[PDB]
Symmetry: none
């Protein structure tokens, strides 16, 4: 067992893409058995998203085409 655990202890499906200033996609590894989608909000609040194509492939658009 390593020093690290998943940063995401829970997730949220309640988010309007416009509120997000940053999205980090972290691949699974020794630190976490699952992938993680960490979104940062305008205000500096960070949340984790569930891995469904909707939200993310959508949020990525709002950020990638801005």
């Amino acid at each position: 067992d390593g020093d690290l655990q998943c940063l995401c202890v829970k997730t949220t499906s309640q988010v309007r893409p416009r509120h997000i200033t940053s999205l980090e996609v972290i691949k699974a590894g020794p630190h976490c058995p699952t992938a993680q989608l960490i979104a940062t909000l305008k205000n500096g609040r960070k949340i984790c998203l569930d891995l469904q194509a909707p939200l993310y492939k959508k949020i990525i658009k709002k950020l990638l085409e801005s």
Copy 2:
């Protein structure tokens, strides 16, 4: 005044451990793609190159 001035596509997807997508803002006209390699090394990816497209898919666990 972006952090990602000089980009690259000279990256082996299998070496990317994470990808941060940053929205264009007051200090950068365009969105930025910052990838981290296992080495810990951080590089910027080309928003116009097709690489990051399949890169993000690999991290999602193929």
Copy 3:
């Protein structure tokens, strides 16, 4: 090929939430200082000792 081409000192240590110190390597002749502000923005910092020292002491103390 460094990620940090142009660096800056125009930052408020009070708004930095994380600092990534990257060792100089085969792809970058010098160390690289990457700070993350609360709003998510990322910037490269000048290597000026007094700067990162003031920044690390603050992050490592809240």
Copy 4:
């Protein structure tokens, strides 16, 4: 939504094996700061903020 990345720290590490160090400020995610070092192979470990070791690794990292 977030918690501490570090659940424990290691002390048996060669300062010259560290290619990267991440200094994370305490906040809602973790009530304590954290020191995450990546190693030459890509392995990540956390460092004790009490021990003087990390201060050594930092200065050794910045001076190239």
